[PDB]
Design a binder for this molecule. Structure first.
Ligand code: AGS
Ligand code: AGS
Ligand code: AGS
Ligand code: AGS
Ligand code: ADP
Ligand code: MG
Ligand code: MG
Ligand code: MG
Ligand code: MG
Lengths: 435, 327, 330, 317, 353
DNA sequence: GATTCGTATC
DNA sequence: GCTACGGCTATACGG
DNA sequence: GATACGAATCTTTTTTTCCGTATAGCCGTAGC
């Protein structure tokens, strides 16, 4: 078969996972098999090929035949289309029959093949069906494990209606905050496989192919290809597939693995401090725009640059550089989201931070923009102002525009009503102003 | 019926021999038809160059009287989304040609307005049914076409119409309409054409309407300038001389008098002064940089409106300040 | 009865003044039947809408107008679907049979007219979906595009449409039309008036007619039987009085930032429009003989920049203060 | 009237006729002779032989079983979540008696245009049925295929075709068709091709049809030099009076639209060498302002002349 | 009610702050049949809306102040319930399309076109009438129309001028396009002088006894109001109730909290000029923007507070005003205001250092 | 990509 | 022989 | 014992097409 299917781990010691991560998964899973467990769903999130299900299966192999009140998992198959069932009801009938997999029929239900969540209605049905499992009144329920692979959704659906699920396939955009911040849900984020474990497993696979490796005069150059694959990728499946493709080859075809997408804070750090791989800013910016145009085009990135450019040296650079950066960002904001705007703003920020960059600079920590907090406080201000307006319409027949409200009605009007009451709203609209 | 038509539609070419200006493209497509092997074509050029007139005449030459059932013409006036490509174009290409003229022709006019999903889906319809159907893509902007679609199409560029072709078509129009045109009027029409036959025909129709008697009267340059509302070649030179030589009061008076003489706008004067200053032997390399940059901002501000007198004074001051560098 | 701008709207093509290069061409199409696709562009209030409304009437008559005319403006949706369905189906429609009265009184051309007024507000895709609609059905349907900015019309559509530029209506070509309206309404004005009205209304007859109507509504309210003077016209047009402008230029000549800032602060309270005081300063500074070539060259660009910033919808106080400070340091 | 265009008439039918990317074609030949084809993703610029390689590999791997062992789906066919869940699932579930080491092949041409839900269902499709059928994705930009799908595949990147492979294929076609040529004409055809076989064949066909003899004059009078190479020459000029001359003569009077020149200038500047980053970002800013002015309605020659003047001003300073 | 609405002139003869304007309004209302479309422009709080209502009361008689709120519902291209309050009277309508955002085009294209299409025939009356024949629509804040609602009005108020008339209230009529201003009669409303504001406040403190110690305290409020009658009448009530209805010469003038915060920001900018100070200024700007205060006013007050600093030379102020103009133009042609509001501050501190 | 805390190993 | 109503199916619409 | 390595944290508020469900119209069949 394929080397990632024939050289699959047989026990937990052969799984490419960190020791601490394995310990936290093991203890959490063991706790979820108790009669009345505090955690009902275990949400495993991370990149592709991180042994997320490759650890769940081999842990179930030793966990399920320990608590079965006298051996494997029950995985949801989304592609199953039965005769008399709506497509959106396929997961409901799976969760309604999976809840019977309890004592004397115990089985860890694993949901790796998620239902179609790019369609809004079935995504909402999935969310409310998970909420109906977290808030279930059943005295005993089987352990539920949901594996979600964090992958960036590529540029498609040219409509401007791109939602979060249209940008990144992550647990945040599939689940809601009620599920994600539930007392009975445990989240264990997974990290890409480190170079040491990848090297060890690719060397075990090589000593299991030593005969064929030596016959094709490829056994002394195995160290360099394992090192290159370990340094280039963090995907175990992609690493083994590339190793198999290189071994079964008989030529000088170059080693090429899959491509990974950077993070939002990773891209911010690349724009600010530069990349260690290349000292050419033009090449780095061009590759960042080529591979990650879905993130460099969103306005929140240009906002994050303005929010985090002060972390270069904890805020101890020249004011002229900061003025140039913010002026360039303001000028880019007037280009109506053209491709030439981001490619100029990021280039100017990188050029500004390159010249002032000196050795020994103790940089700061970047953060996400607070624009959303301001936008929600604006909506709260709107709600309170409309409450002021409608409560000030029948008691005292008067119409006033919201622009006049945000200037003189919210400081003066409470200062009159509360002063008339110190002897009908009486508080400042939108809360007090600070600093 | 055809005499109650606008001149831009009445004088549409019906055969490939009536398409002027584009000699290399026509002498290639005619041999392509003569050999009988027509590849997938791409016609590119400015508006009013003769791309649609070429492709319709070519299809008429190939198909004769069977143009109705053998040619599918889809343009921007019809929906051409992913479903349209996957159904209408695909069933037109897949079905047989009733053994009429060998291969089918699909003309995609104004394909630059087509969405990228449709242009990407059309790539495996162009190269799969190429034995029975051929695609012709007409576009004015090549940046809106996917690179693969450009790759699977033979690109023919329609150049702006040369002066000789404009003169040859004007002669036919004058013969048909029994009109007389002075050589200076023809020169004015060709310089204002900017390589467009539609503009030539539209201006000629208005010039014929302007004449009190369509016959026994010749359309002079004055008639053309009055009809199209363009400054005369002397007014532009007078304004430029007043700006470059006279003081700030006399130049301001001369510009306003020239503009109020015939209700001349500022944008055409700006373009004329730009064209006249283009062939000027500047010797500082900053006079040109300042002139072009200031006149472009004035031209952009005029496009959004504003105070006209302030813009005219801005033009005068920009020219005067840019020519301060030269001396 | 009605506002004078609507009462004196041109009913026929002979009432459209100062635009003969286009009306002469349009009148010839009454005898012929070769009306082309038309693009009416020019300054606001020049008579583009009135000309097409008069041409439509003179071509069809009030009875055939309802069947042979489709008018779409910015007051209705003109998206890609509207252009590809409603306009295309109206162009594909068959020319209705003229009545015997219509054929015996009106020319009744064998085509209909689609009038797309305020075409500058249409998107580039709705305009792209119109090119083959006008070309294919040109023998049965004609198109009239009316706009103020010809740059907002795409080049493919502008090539297919005959361009008719409507000239700005100044005191040299609209004085007879204004005098006619003054005479029919029995408006008494001093000599020089009805020219100051057309000078204040830069290339706009609608604003001048409204200004004259407003002057008359005060003249017959005063009830003294006296002629309207240019001072009242300037007062009710928003023109800054010359004493205030002289004070502005005297404060500018001193060059002290604080006094100019205080004067601008007390001037913005009077409610004067920035585009008017900037325009008046332009006339004061450009035509004056006490300034050198360099000063005029610099201030021309300063006024151009100020006007361009003001046209974008910016704060008048900041722009006016910056302009006066820049002139004070020239 | 029944003669096929030279692009389709001389489309390779075996892997040995595919010039360029010698190592990758050799590896495809090893896959064809052995049989154990892995899941693969083929990416590259259009017209370098990505599709004609996958199809030839499927032919040489199946032969008489190609009719029932290959399911070819592309952008012209509907490839929603339902087709993947029904048609692809039934094709994968189908049991066909193929020789040893031979597997069914699902050729998903233009996989970069597939929706996200179909790509996510393809994960389960390849996971359940990897022992019987193998998937061969062919695309132009490999990042459009989701990372979970790329993890199960062996990425094969096709590079640009050099000037020697193009000449070899052109000479084979010339010998087959017996056309008259000279060396400079073929050099001009390769130069205008810019690493494109399909465009080189189309240009050679057009030149032969138009004139018959493939020389530089007849090639260049029907085919045009690549306008990115003229935009690069205009933007890299030393003094303004010849950059304006280039923009006028080779771009404006030739018929290229102003928006096309502006869009090409941006891509040229992004890849321009020997220019400082501070210069490059200012050039990008000026090109973006010019692009805004063109998009807002002012598509005139003066706006391009001003952009070149600003670029020269920033260059000299 | 508040003293701003209680002591509001409800007739054209009760206006007492501009007399050359009241006479022009009387001239307009003498023959209301041929009343053109009116555009009242001037500083905020001068009494433009009060004068519009007084003119409507002179035209259609009393009862135009009998306002009721009729909640409307609109649907845009993608189905979404967008709500607009319509304050209506038996003779006039008041709409604020800016309250619904960028989608005011649909409000102008549906509500205004439906109102302008109804002839208001009533009982017979097919010939003409001074009242109840044509209708008055008041568009408050005409400046915030997004250049597309102003395009749908050009033909709406021109073709249907017989059955509808428009009186739009606005300040600083720069963002109003030229075709809209061409169809309308421009009415300038100057701000009251300090003497007139003092007289109005004297009438208010005469009708309601606040025990004025000196007439100077009313003048100080007028000078602090900067021409705003509503603000002056609000501070009068504030210093009245906050001093147990007894105004003293030592009574502090109460100013809006955001103005005090802008002054504190100005002093911080003058004192500290560094990157961390710029980050603190960004926090202050974000807090100010969280209270739905428009960004153009933030920039205007920040600039005119920085120009009041006595420790700044003329070269610094001439650069501050230039940066203010540049960033105001950038803010007008922009999407997010924080970039420009931070760039202006950064350039100001980079110039003052 | 940066900082900070915590291991594992040579 | 005829009719009404439930089940099957094609189509416009929501998000 | 020095150090490389690794994990945690640094995050969220007009237009087109597609996927599954809703719904009314037409045919089949029980029956009175
Ligand atoms: N030593 C190893 N450790 C982990 N996985 C291994 C190992 N050797 C082979 N594999 C295979 O690598 C694959 C890893 O699968 P997982 O990472 O558990 O799935 P995943 O994380 O959901 O990836 P995606 O998102 O489905 S592509 C499985 O097919 C394993 O059989
Ligand atoms: N070479 C030509 N010879 C004669 N008339 C021409 C020529 N080119 C254009 N015309 C005239 O111009 C009209 C419009 O040209 P078309 O070919 O229909 O459009 P086009 O030239 O393809 O430009 P676009 O891209 O469609 S706007 C034709 O109907 C002819 O009347
Ligand atoms: N040449 C003219 N002769 C007589 N009246 C004119 C002339 N030009 C304009 N007017 C008057 O100007 C007023 C408005 O004219 P319209 O043509 O409707 O406006 P416009 O030219 O379309 O400007 P818009 O709508 O802003 S593009 C009417 O009262 C006309 O009578
Ligand atoms: N290496 C090659 N040798 C010979 N002909 C080639 C080669 N590469 C491409 N061609 C020709 O290119 C044409 C079609 O090539 P394709 O493989 O379909 O293009 P492609 O590389 O798949 O690019 P896309 O993305 O599918 S448009 C045929 O005429 C082939 O003969
Ligand atoms: N002539 C006047 N006499 C007394 N009070 C006035 C006068 N004009 C305006 N006001 C007061 O000013 C307050 C607000 O005026 P407003 O109509 O909001 O002005 P604007 O329309 O310019 O915003 C009103 O409450 C009113 O009491
Ligand atoms: Mg897995
Ligand atoms: Mg065409
Ligand atoms: Mg009009
Ligand atoms: Mg292909």
């Amino acid at each position: 078969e394929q080397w990632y299917e024939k050289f699959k781990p047989n026990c937990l010691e052969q799984v490419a996972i960190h020791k601490r991560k394995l310990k936290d998964v093991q203890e959490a899973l063991d706790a979820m098999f108790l009669p009345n467990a505090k955690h009902r769903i275990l949400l495993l999130s991370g990149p592709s090929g991180c042994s997320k299900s490759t650890v769940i299966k081999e842990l179930s192999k030793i966990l399920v035949p320990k608590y079965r009140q006298n051996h494997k998992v029950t995985e949801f198959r989304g592609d199953c289309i039965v005769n008399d069932l709506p497509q959106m009801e396929s997961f409901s009938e799976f969760l309604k029959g999976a809840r019977y997999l309890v004592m004397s029929n115990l089985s860890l239900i694993l949901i790796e093949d998620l239902p179609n969540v790019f369609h809004i209605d079935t995504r909402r049905r999935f969310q409310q069906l998970i909420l109906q499992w977290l808030y279930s009144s059943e005295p005993l329920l089987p352990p539920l494990v949901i594996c979600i692979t964090e992958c960036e959704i590529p540029e498609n659906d040219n409509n401007y209606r791109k939602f979060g699920i249209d940008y990144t396939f992550s647990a945040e955009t599939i689940m809601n905050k009620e599920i994600l911040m539930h007392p009975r849900l445990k989240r264990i984020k997974f990290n890409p496989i480190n170079s040491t474990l990848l090297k060890k497993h690719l060397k075990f696979i090589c000593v299991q192919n030593m005969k064929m490796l030596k016959e094709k005069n490829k056994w002394n150059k195995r160290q360099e290809v394992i090192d290159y694959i370990a340094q280039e990728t963090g995907d175990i499946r992609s690493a083994i597939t590339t190793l198999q493709f290189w071994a079964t080859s008989s030529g000088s075809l170059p080693i090429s693995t899959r491509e990974s997408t950077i993070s939002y804070f990773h891209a911010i750090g690349k724009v600010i401090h530069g990349s260690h791989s290349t000292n050419n800013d033009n090449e780095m910016i061009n590759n960042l725009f080529e591979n990650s145009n879905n993130l460099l085009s969103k306005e929140d990135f240009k906002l994050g640059i303005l929010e985090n450019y002060n972390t270069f040296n904890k805020g101890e650079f020249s004011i002229s550089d900061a003025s140039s950066i913010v002026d360039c960002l303001s000028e880019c904001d007037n280009m109506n989201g053209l491709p030439e705007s981001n490619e100029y703003g990021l280039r100017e920020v990188r050029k500004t931070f390159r010249n002032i960059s000196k050795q020994g600079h103790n940089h700061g920590t970047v953060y996400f923009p607070r624009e959303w907090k301001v936008r929600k406080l604006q909506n709260s201000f709107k709600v309170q102002a409309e409450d002021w307006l409608n409560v000030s319409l029948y008691k005292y027949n008067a119409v006033h525009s919201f622009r006049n409200i945000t200037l003189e009605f919210g400081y003066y009007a409470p200062l009159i009503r509360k002063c008339q009451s110190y002897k009908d709203v009486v508080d400042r609209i939108g809360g007090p102003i600070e600093a | 019926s055809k005499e109650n038509l606008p001149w831009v539609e009445k004088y549409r070419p019906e055969t490939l021999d009536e398409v002027y200006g584009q000699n290399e493209v026509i002498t290639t497509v005619r041999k392509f038809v003569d050999e009988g092997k027509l590849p997938h074509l791409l016609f590119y050029g400015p508006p009013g160059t003769g791309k649609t007139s070429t492709i319709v005449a070519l299809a008429r030459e190939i198909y004769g009287k069977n143009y109705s059932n053998m040619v599918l013409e889809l343009n921007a006036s019809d929906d051409r989304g992913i479903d349209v490509v996957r159904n209408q174009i695909k069933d037109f290409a897949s079905t047989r040609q009733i053994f009429s003229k060998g291969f089918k022709l699909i003309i995609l006019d104004e394909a630059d307005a087509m969405t990228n999903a449709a242009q990407n889906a059309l790539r495996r319809v162009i190269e799969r049914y190429t034995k029975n159907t051929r695609f012709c893509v007409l576009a004015n902007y090549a940046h809106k076409l996917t690179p693969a679609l450009l790759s699977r199409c033979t690109r023919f560029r329609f150049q702006p119409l040369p002066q000789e072709a404009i003169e040859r078509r004007i002669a036919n129009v004058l013969v048909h309409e029994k009109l007389k045109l002075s050589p200076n009027a023809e020169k004015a029409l060709i310089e204002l054409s900017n390589g467009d036959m539609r503009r030539v025909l539209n201006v000629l129709q208005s010039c014929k309407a302007t004449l009190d008697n369509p016959d026994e009267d010749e359309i002079s340059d004055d008639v053309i300038y009055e009809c199209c509302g363009a400054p005369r070649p002397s007014d532009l030179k007078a304004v430029l001389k007043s700006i470059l030589e006279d003081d700030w009061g006399t130049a301001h008076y001369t510009l306003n008098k020239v503009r109020s003489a015939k209700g001349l706008a500022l944008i055409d004067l700006i373009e004329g002064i730009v064209k006249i200053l283009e062939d000027y032997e500047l010797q500082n390399e900053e006079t040109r940089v300042h002139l072009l940059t200031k006149l472009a901002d004035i031209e952009y501000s005029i496009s959004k409106g504003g105070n006209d007198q302030i813009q005219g004074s801005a033009v005068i001051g920009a020219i005067k300040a840019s020519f301060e560098n030269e001396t | 009865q009605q506002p004078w701008v609507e009462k004196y709207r041109p009913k026929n093509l002979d009432e459209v003044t100062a635009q003969d290069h286009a009306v002469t061409v349009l009148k010839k199409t009454l005898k012929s039947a070769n009306l082309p696709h038309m693009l009416f562009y020019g300054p606001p209030g020049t008579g583009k809408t009135s000309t097409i409304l008069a041409l439509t009437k003179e071509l069809y008559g009030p009875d055939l107008m309802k069947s042979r005319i489709l008018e779409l403006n910015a007051s209705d949706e003109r998206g890609i679907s509207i252009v590809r369905e409603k306009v295309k189906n109206f162009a594909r429609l068959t020319v209705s049979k003229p009545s015997k009265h219509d054929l015996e009184n009106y020319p009744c051309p064998p085509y209909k007219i689609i009038i797309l007024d305020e075409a500058d507000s249409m998107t580039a895709d709705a305009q792209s979906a119109l090119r083959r609609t006008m070309e294919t059905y040109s023998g049965v349907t004609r198109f009239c595009l009316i706009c103020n900015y010809v740059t907002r019309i795409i080049d493919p559509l502008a090539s297919r449409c005959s361009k008719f530029r409507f000239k700005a209506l100044d005191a040299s070509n609209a004085i007879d039309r204004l005098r006619f309206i003054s005479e029919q309404e029995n408006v008494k004005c001093d000599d020089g008036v009805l020219e100051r009205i057309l000078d204040i209304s830069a290339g706009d007859l609608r604003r001048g007619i409204t200004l004259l109507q407003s002057a008359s509504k005060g003249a017959q309210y005063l009830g003294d039987g006296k002629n309207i003077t240019s001072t009242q016209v300037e007062e009710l047009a928003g023109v800054v009085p010359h004493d205030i402008l002289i004070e502005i230029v005297e404060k500018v000549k001193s060059g002290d930032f604080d006094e100019i800032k205080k004067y601008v602060n007390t001037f913005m309270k009077s409610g004067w429009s920035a585009a008017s005081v900037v325009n008046q300063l332009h006339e004061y500074y450009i035509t004056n003989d006490n300034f050198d070539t360099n000063f005029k060259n610099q201030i021309s660009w300063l006024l151009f920049t100020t006007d361009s910033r003001l046209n974008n919808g910016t704060n008048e106080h900041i722009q006016l203060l910056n302009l006066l400070v820049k002139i004070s340091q020239l | 009237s029944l003669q096929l265009p030279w692009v389709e008439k001389y489309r390779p039918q075996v892997l040995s006729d595919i010039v360029g990317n010698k190592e990758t074609i050799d590896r495809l030949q090893q896959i064809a002779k052995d049989g154990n084809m892995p899941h693969m993703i083929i990416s590259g610029m259009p017209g370098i032989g990505k599709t004609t390689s996958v199809h030839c590999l499927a032919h040489e791997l199946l032969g008489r079983s190609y009719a029932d062992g290959v399911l070819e789906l592309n952008a012209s066919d509907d490839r929603g979540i339902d087709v993947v869940r029904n048609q692809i699932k039934h094709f994968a579930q189908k049991k066909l008696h193929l020789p040893p080491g031979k597997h069914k092949i699902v050729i998903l041409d233009e996989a970069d245009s597939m929706t996200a839900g179909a790509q996510q269902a393809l994960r389960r499709t390849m996971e359940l049925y990897s022992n019987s059928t193998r998937f061969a994705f062919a695309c132009n930009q490999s990042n459009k295929i989701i990372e979970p799908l790329q993890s199960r595949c062996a990425i094969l990147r096709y590079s640009k075709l050099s000037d020697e492979d193009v000449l070899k294929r052109l000479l084979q076609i010339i010998k087959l068709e017996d056309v008259k040529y000279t060396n400079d004409g073929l050099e001009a055809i390769i130069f205008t091709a810019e690493g494109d076989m399909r465009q080189a064949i189309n240009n050679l066909q057009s030149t032969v049809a138009g004139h018959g003899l493939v020389n530089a004059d007849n090639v260049f009078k029907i085919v045009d030099s690549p306008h990115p190479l003229i935009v690069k020459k205009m933007l890299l000029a030393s003094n303004l009076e010849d950059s304006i001359q280039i923009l006028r003569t080779d771009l404006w009077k030739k018929g290229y639209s102003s928006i096309d020149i502006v869009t090409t200038s941006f891509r040229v500047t992004k890849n321009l060498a020997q220019v400082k980053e501070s210069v490059r970002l200012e050039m990008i800013k000026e090109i973006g302002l010019t692009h805004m002015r063109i998009l807002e309605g002012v598509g005139t020659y003066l706006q391009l002349a001003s952009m070149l003047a600003k670029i020269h001003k920033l260059n000299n300073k | 009610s508040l003293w701003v609405d209680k002591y509001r002139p409800k007739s054209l003869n009760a206006l007492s702050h501009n007399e050359e304007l009241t006479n022009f309004l009387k001239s307009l209302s003498d023959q209301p049949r041929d009343l053109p479309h009116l555009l009242l422009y001037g500083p905020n709080g001068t009494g433009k809306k009060t004068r519009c209502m007084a003119l409507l009361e002179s035209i259609f008689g009393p009862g135009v102040y009998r306002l009721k709120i009729d909640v409307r519902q609109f649907v845009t291209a993608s189905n979404r319930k967008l709500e607009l309050n319509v304050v209506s009277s038996p003779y006039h309508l008041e709409i604020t399309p800016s309250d619904m955002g960028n989608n005011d085009r649909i409000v102008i294209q549906e509500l205004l076109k439906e109102v302008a299409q109804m002839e208001q025939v009533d009982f017979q009356d097919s010939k003409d009438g001074l009242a109840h024949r044509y209708k008055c629509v008041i568009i408050n804040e005409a400046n915030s129309l997004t250049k597309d609602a102003q395009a749908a009005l050009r033909r709406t108020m021109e073709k249907y001028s017989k059955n509808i008339r428009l009186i739009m209230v606005c300040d600083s009529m720069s963002p109003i396009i030229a075709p809209i201003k061409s169809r309308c009669l421009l009415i300038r409303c100057p701000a009251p002088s300090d003497s007139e504001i003092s007289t109005i406040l004297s009438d208010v403190v005469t009708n309601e006894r606040i025990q004025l110690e000196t007439k100077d305290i009313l003048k100080r409020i007028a000078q602090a109001s900067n021409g705003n009658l509503r603000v002056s009448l609000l501070m009068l009530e504030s210093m009245a109730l906050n001093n147990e209805l007894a105004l003293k010469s030592s009574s502090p003038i109460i100013k809006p909290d955001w103005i005090i915060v802008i002054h504190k920001l100005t002093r911080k900018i003058v004192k500290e000029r560094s990157v961390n100070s710029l980050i603190e200024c960004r926090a202050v700007l974000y807090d100010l923007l969280a209270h739905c205060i428009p960004a153009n006013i933030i920039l205007k007050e920040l600039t005119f507070s920085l120009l009041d600093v006595e420790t700044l030379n003329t070269t610094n102020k001439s650069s501050i005003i230039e940066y203010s103009s540049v960033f105001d133009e950038r803010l007008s042609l922009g999407n997010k205001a924080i970039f420009h509001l931070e760039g202006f501050i950064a350039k100001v501190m980079c110039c003052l250092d």
